Amino acid sequence: MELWLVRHGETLWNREGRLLGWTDLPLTAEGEAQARRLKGALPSLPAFSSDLLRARRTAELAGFSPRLYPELREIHFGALEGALWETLDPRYKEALLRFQGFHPPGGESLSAFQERVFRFMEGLKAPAVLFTHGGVVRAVLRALGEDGLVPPGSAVAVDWPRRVLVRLALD
Numbered sequence: 001m002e003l004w005l006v007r008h009g010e011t012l013w014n015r016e017g018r019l020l021g022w023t024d025l026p027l028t029a030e031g032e033a034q035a036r037r038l039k040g041a042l043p044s045l046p047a048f049s050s051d052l053l054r055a056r057r058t059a060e061l062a063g064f065s066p067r068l069y070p071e072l073r074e075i076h077f078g079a080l081e082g083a084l085w086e087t088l089d090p091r092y093k094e095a096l097l098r099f100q101g102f103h104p105p106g107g108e109s110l111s112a113f114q115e116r117v118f119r120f121m122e123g124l125k126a127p128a129v130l131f132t133h134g135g136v137v138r139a140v141l142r143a144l145g146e147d148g149l150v151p152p153g154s155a156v157a158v159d160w161p162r163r164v165l166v167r168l169a170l171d
Contacts, residue, residue: 001160002127004042005137008050008058009034010152017085021077021107021135024053034153035061037170042129042155048072049131058153059131066131071120074133078107099142114139121160 009031013020027035035058042062049059049066050073059066077083080092088096095102095110103109108116117139130136137156138148144164150156157165 001124002157002165003121003124003160004045004127004129004155004157005140006038006042006058006062006129006131006155007134007137007150007152008054008131009061011054013082014152019077019080019083019085019088021074021081022052023081027054027057031152032057032061034058034170038062038153038155041168041170043127045127045129047129047131048124050074050133050136052133055131055133062131064129064131066129069120071116072130072132072136075110075113075135076108078104080104080107099138099148114143118143118161124160 009027011020011025011031012028013025031054039062047059047064047066048069049055051068051070052073055072056068092102100110113135117136137150140158141148141156141164143161144158146164150167151169154169156167159165
């Protein structure tokens with residue numbers, strides 16, 4: 001199934017290097033610029049989006065009117081929301097780098113996050129564009145055996161659950 005995943009435009013915590021999960025930050029001016037550039041660069045397909053502001057706004061500026069699903073939200077970092085990556089306990093750093101065994105207090109475990117994301121994707125019956133988050137795109141790319149890091153406001157098309165089709169980044 002052809003699915004286009006879009007990482008929302010940048011927020012202040014991208015440059016600041018803070019864990020950004022359910023904290024509902026708005027897009028920066030550049031983030032909105034990134035979203036506008038996606039318009040015309042993404043296929044005209046049904047759209048779905050995380051209900052968090054930064055994702056919804058990216059979808060809007062990109063020219064879509066998505067159906068909202070909390071299932072497309074970034075992982076819930078719990079007590080680690082807003083934590084500087086730099087000062088994160090080594091155990092958490094390793095868990096996030098290896099993408100396994102991560103369960104922050106008051107938040108979601110990586111396994112629960114994956115179950116949520118993959119259950120949502122399995123339910124998609126036709127090609128669509130998904131406005132979502134870095135961790136969601138990462139979960140998908142990693143499951144397809146590739147490095148999951150993509151720039152803010154960029155997209156990746158995949159033939160789910162088989163392979164990555166293309167990565168699209170704009171200057």
